[PDB]
Structures are given as C-alpha cells and as structure tokens.
Symmetry: C3
Subunit: 152 residues, 3 copies
Amino acid sequence: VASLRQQVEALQGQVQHLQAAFSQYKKVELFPNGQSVGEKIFKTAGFVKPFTEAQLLCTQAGGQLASPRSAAENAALQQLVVAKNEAAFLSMTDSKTEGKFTYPTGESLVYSNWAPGEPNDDGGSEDCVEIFTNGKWNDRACGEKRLVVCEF
Amino acid sequence: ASLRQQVEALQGQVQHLQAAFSQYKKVELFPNGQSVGEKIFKTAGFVKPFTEAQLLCTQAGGQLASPRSAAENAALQQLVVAKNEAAFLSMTDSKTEGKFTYPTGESLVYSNWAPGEPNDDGGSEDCVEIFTNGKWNDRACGEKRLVVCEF
Amino acid sequence: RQQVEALQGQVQHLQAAFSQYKKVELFPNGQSVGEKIFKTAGFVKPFTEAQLLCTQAGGQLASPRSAAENAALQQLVVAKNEAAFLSMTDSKTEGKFTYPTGESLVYSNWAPGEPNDDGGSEDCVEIFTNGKWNDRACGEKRLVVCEF
Ligand SMILES: [Ca+2]
Ligand SMILES: [Ca+2]
Ligand SMILES: [Ca+2]
Ligand SMILES: [Ca+2]
Ligand SMILES: [Ca+2]
Ligand SMILES: [Ca+2]
Ligand SMILES: [Ca+2]
Ligand SMILES: [Ca+2]
Ligand SMILES: [Ca+2]
C-alpha cells in the first residue's frame, strides 16, 4: 500500500500546481481579445469578414460564430465589440424561414436583444444579425463585412 | 490494488498535460508576452491613457506593469524595445506629491529613474513611463503610452 | 481510498479546459501539425530580425519538413496574404540550402526555376500563398512565422 499513497500526494500536488499555472495562463490568453462567461469563451479575430467567411473561420478553428444565449453572454460580447468599436456578426440567421431567427443548429432563439424597430428585413434582404456597441441587435444583410468573433 | 492500475494511467495523463502545457506557454507568450519568475507581462499592442490602460488591465484580472526588481524591469524593457513604444507602469503620486506608490498604497521597493527624474514637469506629471532603455520618467497621466499588464 | 478518484475528476476537468484553451490560443494566428505548432507574429520583418524573434521566444522560424507541414504553414500565409520567411538559407554554401541545425534539406517545394539566386543576392527562402518556395534576399521584409 503506502507507496501508492505517496504517489497520490505527489500527483495531487503536481496537479494543483498545473491548475494554478493554467488559471494564470487563461487570463493572459484572453487579454486583450477575449472574454469568458461560464464555460464559454468569445475571442475576436480582430478583423472584418462577410458572414460566410466569418462562419467558416470559426468552424474550421473548432468553434462557432458568437451566439449569445443570455444577458450575461451578450454583455461579454458587447465588451469585445466596444473595445474594437466595430459591430460583430452573430451566428443566427432567418434565411430558412423569413422572420424566424435560428441558431445554426436549427433551434429558435432563447434570448434576443433587438434594437427597436428590428428585425425589419430592410431592402427585402436582411438575413444575418449584427450586434452593435450598445449591445442591441440589428438584422443585417449577410454580405456586409463585420467583426469576426467566434465562441469556444 | 486495483487502484494501482488507475493511478498509473493518471500519472501518464498528468505527464501528457505537463508537456503540452509547456509547449503552449511559449506559443502563448509569442510575440506579446514575457515571463519573469512567477509573473507574466503581456502587452495589448496599443497605446492608451493611464486611467484606460489601468481599467483594461483590471478588467482582465491583472494590474498594470509594476516592476519590483531589475530582472522584472529588464523583462518589461524587452517588450518595450520590441514594440518600440514607452509604456506606463502602475505607480503614481496623485495622492501625495513626491511619494510614488504601487496602486496598493505601499512605497516603491525598486526604482530605475532616469537622471533628474521624477521632476514633476509643468507641475503636472503624476504617472511613470518606462523608456526603451529601461529608465523610468514621470509623465502626465493623460498621455497615451503602451498598455502592458502583469498577470 | 477514492481520494484517487477525486484526483481523476480534476485531471479530466483540466483535459477538457486545456482542450478548449488550445483552440482559443491557435485562433487566428496558429496552426498545429502533429506535434509542431506554427504561429505568426502578424507583422513583417527581415530575416535576422525574424530569426531573432523566434529564438527569443523559445522556438525557431518555420521549417516545413513535410507536405503536411508546408500545407499548414500555407494556410497561415493565405490568411495573412503575405509570404513568410522559412528558416533555411544557403548562405554558407551557395546552392545547398540548410536548416539552421546544419543538415541538408529533407523536403522541398520549390517553384519552377527556383532556387535561382537572382542578382547574386538570394540566400533566404520565402513561402508564397500557393505553398511554393522561392529563394529571396534576406534583407526583404516578410511575415514572421515561428514554429514551436
Ligand atoms: Ca429572407
Ligand atoms: Ca430576414
Ligand atoms: Ca435592419
Ligand atoms: Ca501632483
Ligand atoms: Ca508628480
Ligand atoms: Ca518627467
Ligand atoms: Ca550567397
Ligand atoms: Ca543563394
Ligand atoms: Ca528567386
């Protein structure tokens, strides 16, 4: 037995040391271009791309375009948008069924923070969503270039 | 002694984490970070006024660069030369003129003032700036200097 | 007792958090190929300054030793739309490109007619956006990509 027990005290100690260095490196990681809320991390690319290119960039990297599902997440996304001062695309579109915004998974929105008047399908052709510096959403034509923020 | 089987599998995965985390540190710190002892300095890459620079670092969990030793100052200095822009440090004397404190309130443990500094030029220099040669100069808090935080 | 299986839980939690961390770290500026990570600085510098930057950071300038590595490096160079410097030079022996360890090349992906040492001036190697290599003067400014 008790060799076993020494090994546990040893392993536990090297594990606690690794979670200490991991917390510090997580903060350094997110500065300046990232934000975490719960288990989700938003990180911006720092550049501007049309919806399809933005979505491709995020899935290829193993994530998804920012999809705020609660008020706290929208706040965290807003910090990133305020810091960069460019509005960002969110993941959701209504291109399947005009007027029903769906997460890229197909499910209906659980949270929304639409600017008054929106969504308004302006010009007959506004299928993507953009979050502005004030945290409110506006629907926008997918072909516009907006800030790429992915979530992981 | 079933446990021994699971403990050896664990040792192997801890060992895997330890080595992957070691590679990641270097990747992470490239090109905007520098570590000295237990501390990491990371530059935001952009220039901002003191009160803003300070907010950005506190919102991110950190603190503005506060070198407490020559080894710490030389590591901050390497980031400043690479970026080629002077950077604010955390210390000010906006509460008591002449007494520079860390944001916590204690007096300076190390200083590397340029000859003649701090000189409170114009009656209005309450923040400290580190130059590309590693010497500190007291500067007006409303200038825009490189944001470097410490973690 | 199962103070082991408490530890088990903490290891698996780190493995999940560390896996999420890697994705965030590599977005948008890095690529992993096997054990190797390529990461760009984002800016452009001449060979010696690029070579210093990488070694200072604990790593090396990109040395793609396989078609697979050169492809990950190329995915980075297309995203920045800027050709990158590779580690290899022939500055010791004109026409034998060496990796900085001193050995001869394993893998090459030269463009047709390269290396041609245009002007007598060309001792460093750039990778273009199409993945093809060209020998270029070391004093040109190119994207800094290091490998870890
Ligand atoms: Ca439509
Ligand atoms: Ca619509
Ligand atoms: Ca609209
Ligand atoms: Ca004063
Ligand atoms: Ca003063
Ligand atoms: Ca002064
Ligand atoms: Ca030559
Ligand atoms: Ca040559
Ligand atoms: Ca050539």
